[PDB]
Scaffold this active site. Structure first.
Site, PDB file in Angstrom:
ATOM      1  N   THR A  56      -3.424   4.948  -4.152  1.00 10.89           N
ATOM      2  CA  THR A  56      -2.465   5.776  -3.433  1.00 10.89           C
ATOM      3  C   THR A  56      -1.080   5.706  -4.061  1.00 10.89           C
ATOM      4  O   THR A  56      -0.301   6.657  -3.941  1.00 10.89           O
ATOM      5  CB  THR A  56      -2.399   5.348  -1.973  1.00 10.89           C
ATOM      6  OG1 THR A  56      -1.808   4.048  -1.887  1.00 10.89           O
ATOM      7  CG2 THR A  56      -3.791   5.288  -1.393  1.00 10.89           C
ATOM      8  N   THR A  57      -0.748   4.594  -4.711  1.00 17.51           N
ATOM      9  CA  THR A  57       0.527   4.494  -5.405  1.00 17.51           C
ATOM     10  C   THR A  57       0.513   5.243  -6.729  1.00 17.51           C
ATOM     11  O   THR A  57       1.538   5.799  -7.133  1.00 17.51           O
ATOM     12  CB  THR A  57       0.885   3.028  -5.637  1.00 17.51           C
ATOM     13  OG1 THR A  57       0.713   2.296  -4.419  1.00 17.51           O
ATOM     14  CG2 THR A  57       2.316   2.891  -6.105  1.00 17.51           C
ATOM     15  N   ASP A  93      -8.828  -2.021   1.291  1.00 13.81           N
ATOM     16  CA  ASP A  93      -8.830  -1.457  -0.056  1.00 13.81           C
ATOM     17  C   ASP A  93      -9.991  -2.000  -0.877  1.00 13.81           C
ATOM     18  O   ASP A  93     -10.666  -1.245  -1.588  1.00 13.81           O
ATOM     19  CB  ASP A  93      -7.505  -1.755  -0.754  1.00 13.81           C
ATOM     20  CG  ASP A  93      -6.423  -0.754  -0.411  1.00 13.81           C
ATOM     21  OD1 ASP A  93      -6.669   0.132   0.434  1.00 13.81           O
ATOM     22  OD2 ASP A  93      -5.321  -0.850  -0.991  1.00 13.81           O
ATOM     23  N   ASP A  96       0.834  -1.193   0.000  1.00 19.16           N
ATOM     24  CA  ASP A  96       0.000   0.000   0.000  1.00 19.16           C
ATOM     25  C   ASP A  96       0.872   1.248   0.000  1.00 19.16           C
ATOM     26  O   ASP A  96       1.702   1.436   0.892  1.00 19.16           O
ATOM     27  CB  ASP A  96      -0.917  -0.012   1.222  1.00 19.16           C
ATOM     28  CG  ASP A  96      -2.133   0.872   1.056  1.00 19.16           C
ATOM     29  OD1 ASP A  96      -3.054   0.489   0.308  1.00 19.16           O
ATOM     30  OD2 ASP A  96      -2.177   1.946   1.687  1.00 19.16           O
TER      31      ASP A  96
HETATM   32  N1  LIG Z   1      -4.593  -7.867 -14.126  1.00 18.27           N
HETATM   33  C1  LIG Z   1      -4.055  -6.667 -14.437  1.00 18.27           C
HETATM   34  N2  LIG Z   1      -3.555  -6.426 -15.664  1.00 18.27           N
HETATM   35  C2  LIG Z   1      -3.018  -5.238 -15.982  1.00 18.27           C
HETATM   36  N3  LIG Z   1      -2.934  -4.205 -15.130  1.00 18.27           N
HETATM   37  C3  LIG Z   1      -3.400  -4.309 -13.867  1.00 18.27           C
HETATM   38  C4  LIG Z   1      -3.999  -5.576 -13.443  1.00 18.27           C
HETATM   39  N4  LIG Z   1      -4.370  -5.414 -12.163  1.00 18.27           N
HETATM   40  C5  LIG Z   1      -4.036  -4.153 -11.800  1.00 18.27           C
HETATM   41  N5  LIG Z   1      -3.457  -3.496 -12.815  1.00 18.27           N
HETATM   42  C6  LIG Z   1      -2.965  -2.100 -12.779  1.00 18.27           C
HETATM   43  O1  LIG Z   1      -2.009  -1.936 -11.736  1.00 18.27           O
HETATM   44  C7  LIG Z   1      -2.113  -0.616 -11.209  1.00 18.27           C
HETATM   45  C8  LIG Z   1      -1.728  -0.580  -9.737  1.00 18.27           C
HETATM   46  O2  LIG Z   1      -2.770  -1.085  -8.917  1.00 18.27           O
HETATM   47  P1  LIG Z   1      -2.506  -1.317  -7.349  1.00 18.27           P
HETATM   48  O3  LIG Z   1      -1.018  -1.414  -7.136  1.00 18.27           O
HETATM   49  O4  LIG Z   1      -3.385  -2.459  -6.912  1.00 18.27           O
HETATM   50  O5  LIG Z   1      -3.069   0.000  -6.616  1.00 18.27           O
HETATM   51  P2  LIG Z   1      -2.501   1.473  -6.903  1.00 18.27           P
HETATM   52  O6  LIG Z   1      -3.385   2.011  -7.996  1.00 18.27           O
HETATM   53  O7  LIG Z   1      -2.635   2.155  -5.570  1.00 18.27           O
HETATM   54  O8  LIG Z   1      -1.078   1.240  -7.317  1.00 18.27           O
HETATM   55  C9  LIG Z   1      -3.541  -0.172 -11.451  1.00 18.27           C
HETATM   56  O9  LIG Z   1      -3.537   1.141 -12.008  1.00 18.27           O
HETATM   57  C10 LIG Z   1      -4.097  -1.144 -12.465  1.00 18.27           C
HETATM   58  O10 LIG Z   1      -4.469  -0.426 -13.640  1.00 18.27           O
HETATM   59 MG   LIG Z   2      -4.795  -0.791  -5.946  1.00 15.12          MG
END
Ligand SMILES: Nc1ncnc2c1ncn2[C@@H]1O[C@H](COP(=O)(O)OP(=O)(O)O)[C@@H](O)[C@H]1O
Ligand SMILES: [Mg+2]
Ligand SMILES: Nc1ncnc2c1ncn2[C@@H]1O[C@H](COP(=O)(O)OP(=O)(O)O)[C@@H](O)[C@H]1O
Ligand SMILES: [Mg+2]
Lengths: 49, 98, 525, 540
Positions: free
Chosen positions: D105-106, D403, D72
């Site tokens: 948040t990232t 989340d 997170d």
């Molecule tokens: N299965 C997936 N395939 C491609 N991109 C993904 C997938 N799951 C999540 N993402 C991308 O990864 C990014 C990071 O998500 P996450 O790390 O869970 O939260 P945050 O947006 O706070 O970083 C998101 O913007 C999302 O678009």
């Molecule tokens: Mg996320």
């Protein structure tokens, strides 16, 4: 009596805007809701209310 | 001080409350209004009751003030409201007034 | 310096007198001014000051920056004082006052260096200031139509001009409309405490809202609070200053009994006292109960069982705003809960606002208050938003008091400088130099505007001077177009009293600084 | 380049302006902007590795040596010990994104870092920072309008929860609990839907109890449609299981009454002593009889009780639980449908809550006991019980489930979604670039820089997954342009397709809008600051 002349210093508007008031001014607020009286009948108490 | 029940009942009966911290200000107000500082909560007799032309709350600059204003060109105590752009300037003007 | 066996003053006393100390005072005032120079105009920037504790503050406001600076120079503190004075009396122009004062001092510095008597400079400043104030009063544009739409547009334009220098300048129209709407609901005194300002972290600036009522944060609910309904379509509000808890009747009360029956009777009497207060509140017909004093868990569960809402430890300011919005009365006793002392609003609701819970009182038709809910990504973001809105609110209040405006963007300063130069051309010549210096110093505002925007200040100043001399009163700096324009038709409007107070305070500070000939510092105790 | 200026007067006399000015420091002009941009770039570059399904965790250590492993971004920045003011601004930005939305948040930190990185070269090319901020603001407006345009609506009804399951799965994909991916997604969806006011109103989070106990397996995490309580039955010999329990929630300690006011009961004779003792005994018997008269099977107290009451409860077949916390009392009352009663005299049958099963649960060779109140009729409160192999994964599961709950709450508030995986950023960048072609020349540079900064999220996603960033992003952008499909993103999991609509990668529209808005506002603030005045004293 010299002490009968009081001076209140309120900051901001330049010394040309000073004036003379026939009474007194206290830099505080009213305790209650009523904030203006036009025919005042002040009753003064030296004891706590 | 002003008790909460007393303040509530004064608000019920439309009575303006002013709390003077210093006894010097209390004495000066008694002089300038014509009232006698009662020592108890007894209702004032007609002689001890003070009178003034207007008492109101107002703001000058950014400070809230309570004004005891006489319409007549007379009174035991008169006050000068000094304005200015600096504390030191107003102090010097006060020295000149003295 | 022959060492006297017994020295006159305390050892370590520092004394500086004559021309050099006055020149040093002028230099110190210059140093203070240059610390706020870049924060002027729509292209101004922000300053970040970190105190000893490490808690940083970010501001575009001149008075705030000067206060956060630990100024110790005796002559420099006058500029901070006049900035505070301008903030108190007007609320906007806290940078202009300092810039004008320092520019006056800088302009008269060469004359001081060559032995000119400071009384002459003081008299010249006072004459020029009187003439400039009279000119401002004479040429200020006032509309004697008393048209509500025209007055509202004037207030909105003034608020927009006051706001177009802060980080909320992109949404300045939105915020100015909100500020004007907020101020116009105050009744006659326009007290600032009747405009609540709540800062809730998270969310865009455009998520900020103005509630036609009162709103405040949820205040430490007890157990059984979640069982209360959180929406009412015509609640009656019981504003109270009462502690609804099981407690001693008085701190000095002592109960003396000698029978178990009396013991049980005493316990039941305490319970009956609490339940009598609660029953009177319930039979008053109210649905929402707010108290300045704590409300216990027993009372919370009692109100939950009656489908009522309770909230204790509400801050006093919020209670006063609720009084003004709903129209009740804060009751310290519940013995007479008549219908008149009960507040009334159309809709009450508790909602999620960016990770926090807030109580909303909306639909108040006779409301005399409002509450700003500011959204932002950081604490200092919302703080600077609050400062900017305070500037706008003060400008709108002053404009409500009197609707006299002068075009901004250096237009008024240019016109005053032209007038003062034309006057100074018609006097003997000792006062002519000083009044001309005053007029030249008046040109600091458009020059600083152009410098902050990144223009060539000299060419813009020449064009402005030519336009003013040739004819035209409200021609000033046009930031977006790299040029000059008629700032009155550009709606760069500021109340006349802002410039009046700025000139008066700057002149008074300059005269005070000039009048000093010796500085003496006693050793610290 | 510090302590403002130093003149000591032209005449040599001392020149002291600011208190302790010789020890303070200041930064002015473009150097301050460059330092702020450098600090923000450092923070964003540190954070960007934890972005996406292939993002890695950061192991954070506090002052006392306690260690938390997390993905997170808000947690990482909160536990980070920063001193730079711009770093604190980044931390506040991440916390704001957490508060308003709960996810992303990232992303905000990386986006702000990219924006400031582009503003750096824009400034070096000779542009006023306010112009850059205005261009960023109008580009963000264009991007938000485009996001609203390309969004899709989903059903948020109970009968069909599949879109909600997919959204929660997308949220949980980057977290370590993806080993139980669909299970956690489903329990989060069910928890949010259970405790939620139907008419699009708020989801109240204190109605969701998140509890974690070590041991067991992460897959053993389950959703309890009731209350889990850290307490147990007061007497060791009352039964550990109650069927169809009629709960009796009380806030009065099972003790002889005591007035709040200072009181003294005088004993003046032997008869007084006998009467007092009889009063005590009869009070105990009376309170037990009053509880029993309502027909209750279980008694829940908040303030505990003493030995006589305990044995009387055991003797009368009334299992009881004492010292239950106030929030737990409220949750039990809400779930079971009973009312909180302040004293026995007011206890009636109608105020009794009902629970299908109340059980005491053991946790292996640990001696700890925890109480389960489940099988309620129409429980309006829900509990999540998290198990794991160590406390670190338990805390990470707690925040990951938080989340997921936040994302489903946002979906309840607004049911419009956009397809993530970098597709939304690519489409927004394309829209911004198209708009910049029509803008006057000067703001064109700022808008193009905004588009390039938007393009960083797909770059980070591709880099984290091992693919070449520039080539992959360029190919996806070309495909998005050639055929109108804003759903094409970065195939992080190498499923063999770039269509995120088919891959079921779903993000809340309001989350993306908040990301862009907050990043733009913080970047505007950072660009507007041109002066720093630190004490520079470096105290202990
Ligand atoms: N299965 C997936 N395939 C491609 N991109 C993904 C997938 N799951 C999540 N993402 C991308 O990864 C990014 C990071 O998500 P996450 O790390 O869970 O939260 P945050 O947006 O706070 O970083 C998101 O913007 C999302 O678009
Ligand atoms: Mg996320
Ligand atoms: N749109 C604008 N165009 C030109 N000048 C402006 C504009 N808005 C404000 N100004 C000028 O900027 C100056 C400074 O305003 P501001 O920085 O908001 O407050 P302060 O007067 O306290 O510095 C004012 O004198 C005003 O004339
Ligand atoms: Mg201003």
């Amino acid at each position: 009596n010299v002490d009968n002349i009081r001076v209140c210093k309120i900051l901001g508007s330049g010394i040309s805007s000073s004036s003379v008031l026939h009474g007194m001014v206290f830099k505080k607020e009213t305790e209650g809701d009523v904030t203006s009286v036009k025919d005042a009948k002040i009753a003064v108490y030296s004891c706590p209310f | 001080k002003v008790a909460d029940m007393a303040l509530h009942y004064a608000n019920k009966y439309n009575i303006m409350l002013v709390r003077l911290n210093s006894k010097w200000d209390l004495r000066r107000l008694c002089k300038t209004v014509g009232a006698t500082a009662l020592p108890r909560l007894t209702p004032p007799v007609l002689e001890e009751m003070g009178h003034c032309d207007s008492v109101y709350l107002s703001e000058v600059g950014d400070t809230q003030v309570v004004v005891f204003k006489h319409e007549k060109e007379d009174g035991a105590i008169s006050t000068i409201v000094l304005r200015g752009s600096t504390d030191n300037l107003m102090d010097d003007i006060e020295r000149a007034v003295d | 310096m022959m060492p006297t066996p017994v020295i006159l003053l305390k050892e370590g006393t520092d004394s500086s007198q004559g021309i050099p100390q006055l020149v040093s005072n002028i230099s110190a005032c210059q140093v203070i001014a240059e610390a706020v120079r870049t924060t002027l105009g729509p292209r101004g920037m922000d300053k970040l000051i970190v105190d000893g504790r490490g808690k940083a503050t970010i501001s575009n406001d001149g008075a705030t920056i000067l206060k956060l600076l630990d100024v110790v120079h005796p002559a420099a503190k006058t500029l901070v004082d006049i900035a505070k004075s301008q903030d108190a009396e007007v609320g906007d122009g806290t940078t202009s006052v300092t810039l004008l004062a320092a520019e006056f001092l800088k302009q008269v510095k060469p004359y001081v260096e060559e032995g000119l008597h400071p009384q002459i400079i003081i008299r010249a400043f006072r004459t020029a200031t009187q003439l400039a104030v009279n000119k401002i009063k004479e040429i200020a544009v006032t509309v004697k139509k008393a048209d509500k739409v025209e007055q509202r547009k004037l207030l909105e334009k003034c608020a927009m001009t006051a706001l177009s220098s802060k980080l909320i300048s992109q949404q300045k129209a939105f915020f100015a409309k909100m500020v004007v709407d907020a101020v116009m609901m105050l009744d006659d005194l326009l007290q600032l405490k009747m405009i609540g300002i709540k800062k809730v972290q998270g969310g865009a600036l455009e998520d900020s809202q103005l509630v036609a009522g009162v709103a405040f944060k949820k205040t430490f609910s007890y157990a059984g609070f979640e069982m209360q309904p959180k929406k009412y379509h015509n609640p009656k509000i019981a504003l109270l200053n009462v502690e609804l808890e099981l407690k001693a009747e008085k701190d000095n009360a002592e109960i003396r009994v000698h029978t178990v029956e009396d013991y049980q009777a005493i316990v039941d009497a305490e319970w009956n006292i609490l339940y009598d207060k609660l029953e009177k509140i319930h039979h008053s017909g109210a649905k929402v109960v707010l108290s300045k004093l704590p409300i216990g868990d027993v009372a919370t569960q009692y109100f939950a069982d009656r489908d009522m809402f309770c909230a204790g430890r509400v801050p006093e300011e919020d209670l006063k705003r609720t009084m003004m919005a709903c129209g009740g009365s804060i009751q310290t006793s519940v013995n007479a809960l008549s219908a008149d002392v009960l507040g009334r609003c159309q809709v009450f609701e508790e909602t999620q606002i960016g990770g926090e819970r807030y109580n909303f009182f909306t639909g108040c038709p006779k409301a005399k208050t409002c509450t700003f809910i500011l959204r932002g990504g950081a604490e200092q973001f919302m703080e600077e938003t609050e400062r900017s809105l305070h500037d706008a609110i003060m400008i709108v209040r002053r404009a409500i008091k009197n609707d006299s405006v002068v075009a901004g963007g250096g237009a008024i300063e240019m016109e005053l400088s032209k007038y003062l130069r034309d006057y100074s051309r018609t006097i003997p010549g000792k006062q002519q130099l000083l009044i001309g210096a005053y007029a030249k110093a008046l040109e600091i505002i458009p020059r600083q505007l152009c410098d902050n925007a990144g223009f060539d200040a000299t060419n813009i100043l020449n064009k402005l001077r030519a336009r003013h001399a040739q004819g035209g009163t409200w021609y000033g700096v046009d930031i977006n177009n790299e040029d000059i324009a008629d700032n009155f038709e550009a709606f760069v409007w500021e109340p006349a009293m802002v410039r009046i107070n700025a000139l008066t305070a700057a002149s008074e500070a300059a005269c005070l600084i000039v009048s000093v000939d010796e500085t003496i510092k006693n050793p610290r105790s | 380049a510090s302590m403002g200026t130093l003149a000591f007067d032209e005449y040599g006399r001392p020149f002291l302006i600011i208190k302790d000015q010789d020890r303070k420091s200041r930064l002015m002009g473009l150097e301050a902007l460059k330092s702020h941009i450098m600090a923000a770039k450092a923070v964003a570059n540190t954070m960007r590795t934890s972005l996406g399904p292939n993002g890695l965790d950061k192991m954070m250590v506090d002052k006392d040596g306690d260690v938390t492993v997390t993905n997170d971004g808000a947690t990482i920045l909160s536990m980070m010990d920063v001193d730079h003011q711009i770093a604190k601004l980044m931390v506040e930005l991440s916390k704001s994104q957490d508060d308003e939305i709960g996810d992303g948040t990232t992303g905000v930190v990386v986006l702000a870092g990219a924006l400031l990185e582009e503003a750096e070269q824009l400034l070096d090319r000779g542009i006023h920072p306010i112009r850059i901020a205005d261009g960023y603001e109008q580009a963000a407006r264009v991007a938000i309008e485009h996001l609203d345009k390309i969004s899709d609506s989903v059903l948020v009804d109970i009968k069909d929860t599949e879109p909600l399951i997919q959204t929660a799965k997308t949220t949980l994909g980057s977290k370590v609990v993806n080993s139980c991916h669909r299970q956690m997604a489903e329990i989060a969806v069910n928890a949010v839907l259970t405790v939620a006011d139907m008419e699009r109103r708020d989801v109240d989070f204190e109605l969701i109890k998140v509890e974690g106990k070590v041991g067991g397996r992460l897959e053993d995490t389950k959703l309890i449609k009731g209350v889990i309580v850290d307490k147990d039955f007061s007497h060791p010999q009352m039964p550990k299981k109650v069927e169809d329990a009629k709960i009796a929630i009380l806030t009065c300690p099972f003790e002889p009454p005591k007035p709040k006011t200072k009181h003294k009961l005088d004993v003046t004779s032997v008869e007084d002593y006998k009467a007092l003792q009889k009063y005590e005994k009869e009070k105990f018997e009376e309170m037990i009889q009053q509880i029993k008269e309502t027909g209750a099977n279980l008694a829940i107290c908040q303030w505990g009780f003493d030995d006589e009451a305990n044995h009387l409860l055991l003797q009368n077949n009334l299992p009881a639980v004492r010292w239950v916390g106030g929030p737990e009392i409220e949750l039990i009352a809400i779930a079971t449908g009973g009312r909180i009663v302040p004293r026995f005299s007011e206890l009636t049958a109608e105020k009794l809550g009902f629970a299908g099963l109340v059980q005491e649960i053991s946790f292996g060779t640990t001696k700890d006991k925890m109480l389960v109140i489940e099988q309620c009729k129409n429980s309006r409160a829900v509990t999540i019980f998290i198990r794991g192999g160590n406390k670190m994964i338990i805390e990470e599961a707690k925040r990951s489930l938080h989340d997921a709950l936040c994302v489903i709450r946002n979906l309840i508030r607004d049911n419009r979604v956009v397809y993530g995986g970098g597709a939304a950023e690519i489409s927004c960048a394309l829209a911004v670039s198209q708009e910049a072609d029509k803008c006057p020349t000067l703001e064109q540079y700022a808008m193009r820089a905004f588009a390039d900064a938007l393009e960083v999220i797909p770059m980070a996603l591709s880099e984290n997954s091992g693919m070449n960033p520039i080539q992959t992003m360029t190919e996806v952008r070309a495909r998005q342009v050639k055929e109108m499909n804003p759903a094409l993103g970065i195939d992080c999991l190498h499923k063999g397709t770039n269509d995120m609509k088919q891959q079921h990668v779903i993000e809340t529209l309001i989350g993306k809008k908040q990301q862009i808005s907050l990043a733009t506002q913080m970047v505007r603030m950072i660009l507007k600051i041109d002066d720093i005045r630190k004490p520079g004293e470096s105290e202990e």
